[PDB]
């Protein structure tokens, strides 16, 4: 495959994996583990269910599996299941012997330190990687853009987080989590569909509503317009066919679902949504740099892909500088240049950025935490990895 560093975005919803200088993930698959179950459902000799089924092998066969997720909110909940993703990732997707390899990992900006420690311990002591580096997921997405300033916001399956950057300095006091992302919009889609009477409360049906959200949802650009189309008109109604063959009608739930990123109170969170979170983050930066942040807001991660999200977010920041800085005076609004970067690749920007960064530091062997350094200092060897 390659002799250069391996890179692994072990995301909350998808693992993406490959090597330094890859222009796109070598593989990606759901970060799911399954165990065999029987369920008053179809059975077939067309496939054989092993005791542990993971990644693509599980998601293609999940009618037969008790599906479980090793991660939530960007943290590993169960390491015995994350070991069964990492075994699969290295031994039967990449088909590697990890002994002495160097690997780049990722995690979100405010995780428990016990998560990075036990993730590095596992890399040194199950697999025996020769070197490890862990990067904050949103600073990777800035190397993908070929860029060195402008606030980058990453929204994944687990967490939405923001990292302001100016002239290659990373503003660690302004980095932030919004604990609402692509999974809370999916648990919410199940809860909207339950008002229509459709039940999706089996563990294997969660991937079906992920595929449904990912297919049919869009972010409303103007809520009183989509509420007009929703209440006055049939035009929003769309038929989705489940893998069961059942057809379900979905309507206001197309815009009303991804709206929880802009209004977290719909999912019971008191936090401010994307527009108000990015504004209260840029507007907390020092006076000299705020222009260079509004001139380059960078979107990233799969939950930034909803149709209309770049346009809703740009509008909803022009609309919010207008309330909170101009106090509703139109005279200065045309002077407020805000720009959203919303590139075609952006779902993979954390991986594509990781694959750039893992080239920049492939040969600098002191830059990685080495296995030989881990085995003498333990967890204190990770203090190499910044503030």
């Amino acid at each position: 495959m390659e002799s250069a560093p391996i890179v692994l975005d072990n995301g909350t919803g998808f693992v993406k994996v490959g090597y330094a200088k890859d222009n796109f993930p070598r593989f990606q698959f759901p970060s799911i583990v399954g165990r065999p179950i029987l369920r008053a459902e179809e059975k077939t000799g067309n496939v054989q269910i092993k005791d542990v089924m993971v990644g693509d092998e599980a998601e293609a066969v999940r009618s037969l599996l008790q599906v479980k997720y090793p991660m939530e909110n960007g943290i590993i909940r169960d390491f015995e299941e994350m070991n069964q993703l990492w075994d699969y990732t290295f031994f039967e997707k990449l088909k590697i012997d990890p002994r002495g390899r160097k690997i780049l990992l990722t995690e979100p900006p405010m995780n428990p330190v016990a998560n990075r420690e036990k993730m590095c311990e596992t890399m040194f002591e199950r697999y025996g990687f020769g070197g490890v580096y862990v990067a904050i997921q949103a600073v990777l997405s800035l190397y993908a853009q070929g860029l060195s300033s402008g606030v980058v916001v990453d929204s994944g399956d687990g967490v939405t987080h923001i990292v302001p950057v100016y002239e290659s300095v990373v503003l660690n006091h302004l980095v932030g989590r919004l604990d609402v992302a692509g999974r809370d919009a999916t648990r919410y889609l199940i809860s909207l569909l339950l008002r229509k009477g459709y039940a999706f409360n089996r563990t294997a049906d969660f991937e079906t509503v992920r595929e449904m959200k990912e297919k049919l949802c869009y972010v409303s650009y103007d809520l009183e317009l989509d509420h007009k189309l929703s209440e006055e008109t049939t035009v929003l109604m769309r038929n989705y066919t489940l893998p069961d063959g059942r057809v379900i009608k979905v309507g206001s739930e197309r815009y009303e679902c991804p709206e929880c990123l802009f209004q977290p109170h719909l999912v019971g969170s008191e936090q401010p949504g994307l527009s108000e979170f990015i504004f209260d983050t840029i507007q907390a930066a020092d006076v000299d740099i705020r222009k260079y942040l509004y001139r380059a807001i960078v979107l990233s991660g799969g939950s930034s892909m909803y149709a209309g999200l770049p346009s809703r977010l740009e509008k909803e920041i022009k609309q919010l500088w207008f309330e909170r800085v101009l106090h509703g005076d139109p005279a200065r609004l045309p002077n407020f240049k805000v720009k959203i970067e919303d590139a075609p690749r952006r779902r993979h920007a954390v991986f594509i950025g990781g694959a750039v960064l893992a080239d920049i530091m492939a040969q600098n062997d002191h830059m990685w935490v080495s296995k030989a350094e881990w085995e003498e200092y333990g967890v204190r060897a990770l203090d190499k990895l910044g503030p």
Partner: protein, 151 residues
């Protein structure tokens, strides 16, 4: 809260109908004179019974513009009056001899007469609508859909 404050109206100025259709060159008083000389020719053509030559001459010029409702309405009053005074068996002999430009002026104003039934008799306009579309084809309505909005 902020969600309802519109900004598109004040940061992204939209097109105007005068960007899509060229503005009228003739001034308001210059068309108000041009119509006020024609309406007496149409009123006279009814009084001498030659109402069909009334329509042929009235239809030789058309007023248009958001500045001229007080004379577009007078032109429409004369046109609906002239349509109400042509015998229904003469209509197929008039329509087959109109140019495609004149036809697209007739059917454009019958859809203005049909917009105001409390001032115009619809029954004779619907009769002209059947005969003008049956003779000259469905595209003559499509040229009305597409036409200038200040006609």
């Amino acid at each position: 809260t902020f969600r309802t404050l519109d900004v598109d109206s004040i940061t992204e100025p939209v097109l105007t109908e005068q960007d899509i259709f060229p503005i009228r060159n003739e001034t308001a008083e210059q068309v108000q004179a041009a119509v006020s000389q024609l309406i007496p020719q149409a009123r006279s053509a009814i009084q001498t019974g030659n109402a069909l030559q009334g329509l042929k001459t009235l239809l030789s010029y058309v007023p248009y513009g958001n500045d001229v409702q007080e004379v577009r309405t007078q032109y429409l009053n004369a046109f609906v009056d002239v349509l109400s005074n042509i015998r229904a068996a003469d209509i197929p002999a008039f329509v087959k001899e109109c140019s495609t430009e004149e036809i697209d002026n007739i059917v454009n104003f019958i859809y203005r007469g049909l917009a105001n039934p409390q001032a115009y008799n619809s029954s004779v306009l619907l009769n002209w609508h059947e005969k003008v579309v049956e003779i000259s084809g469905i595209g003559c309505i499509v040229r009305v859909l597409n036409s200038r909005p200040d006609l």
